[PDB]
Design a protein around this ligand. Structure first.
Ligand SMILES: Cc1cc2nc3c(=O)[nH]c(=O)nc-3n(C[C@H](O)[C@H](O)[C@H](O)COP(=O)(O)O)c2cc1C
Ligand SMILES: Cc1cc2nc3c(=O)[nH]c(=O)nc-3n(C[C@H](O)[C@H](O)[C@H](O)COP(=O)(O)O)c2cc1C
Lengths: 172, 172
């Protein structure tokens, strides 16, 4: 069980069982959101764990969440995030994505199916979860148990472009 | 050797040996940049592997790279990236960060020290590597071998805020 095997087995699940995510597994997923690095060690991530009816219903107003039993809304705090002196670019999406990716890989190791969701209505999320102006919703990570057929760990030959199309050496 | 142990051991190295990164390890790091998911499966990541003198010198014009022996410049292609219908937000930073995080964790497993770098002059990077207007430089991942004392896998009690400060349940 090494990293590449973990990364390959992970796939996007859009078919979830009713079966709830155990608290013990959730807590291990959350631990790695703290462990992850952020620019300047600023730690701008702000997470809302959503597994109860109201919250799940609120999310379903903003996005297709495939009846997943657990969601984590990952926001970034622009009052904490590092801002690059050259151009003013803030690391909000970068820091929060490292955190989300850590959680997604940890979920996978624990046998949880998952899908990363960015196709959500941000203004609905902001209203429903009463986000103040300094928090921006970035990613929603859904997790649960696959109810149908998982995608194959060997699928990437068909589902990704060749490495040579994304990598060059020294120059473009 | 599980995921949390990997995530904890990973730290930011800013003290590198002259010792080059073996090709075999580099290729395993690159493999996971392809394996990683991207929004819409659009695969907008575009990587430049930099381990030769010119390229390293070019990077050193734009950023402090701590004499690392290997760098990967991770760009995103705005002509491929998914664009959210609600607000026009592009996933450029998100997709490229998932890719970079995958590579950083894979590097760690292979015994390579690393540091993620966003404090670079983007216009210098664009000029030096002749990036066309559709590619935006997002992250520089440095890797090599630690020359001094590694940070401790148990440091997070001191180097991170408590989990309770970044996580809430159902509501803020
Ligand atoms: C940043 C990001 C945003 C995504 N947003 C959604 C989403 O809103 N809804 C969805 O069904 N899938 C979403 N996906 C899942 C992708 O469609 C999926 O990762 C990609 O097609 C590759 O498939 P795989 O993850 O099964 O390998 C997202 C993935 C990423 C990385
Ligand atoms: C998105 C991002 C950008 C970063 N940019 C730089 C950088 O430009 N230079 C640098 O020395 N460290 C940079 N870092 C490293 C952080 O300072 C470091 O991850 C943080 O202080 C936590 O320390 P640790 O990684 O040792 O746990 C960056 C880290 C992240 C996640």
């Amino acid at each position: 069980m090494n990293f590449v095997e973990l990364a390959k087995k992970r796939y996007s699940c859009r078919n979830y069982q009713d079966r709830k995510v155990e608290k013990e597994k959730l807590e291990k997923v959350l631990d790695v959101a703290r462990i992850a690095p952020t620019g300047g060690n600023r730690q701008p991530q702000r997470l809302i764990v959503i597994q109860e009816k109201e919250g799940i219903n609120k999310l379903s107003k903003a996005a297709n969440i495939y009846d997943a039993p657990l969601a984590i809304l990952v926001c970034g705090d622009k009052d904490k995030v590092w801002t690059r002196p050259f151009d003013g670019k803030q690391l909000t999406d970068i820091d929060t994505s490292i955190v989300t990716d850590h959680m997604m890989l940890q979920a996978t190791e624990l046998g949880l199916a998952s899908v990363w969701v960015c196709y959500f209505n941000p203004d609905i999320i902001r209203e429903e979860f009463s986000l103040p102006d300094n928090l921006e919703p970035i990613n929603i990570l859904l997790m649960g148990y696959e109810s149908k057929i998982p995608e194959s760990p060997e699928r990437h030959e068909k589902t990704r472009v060749p490495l040579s199309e994304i990598v060059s050496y020294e120059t473009l």
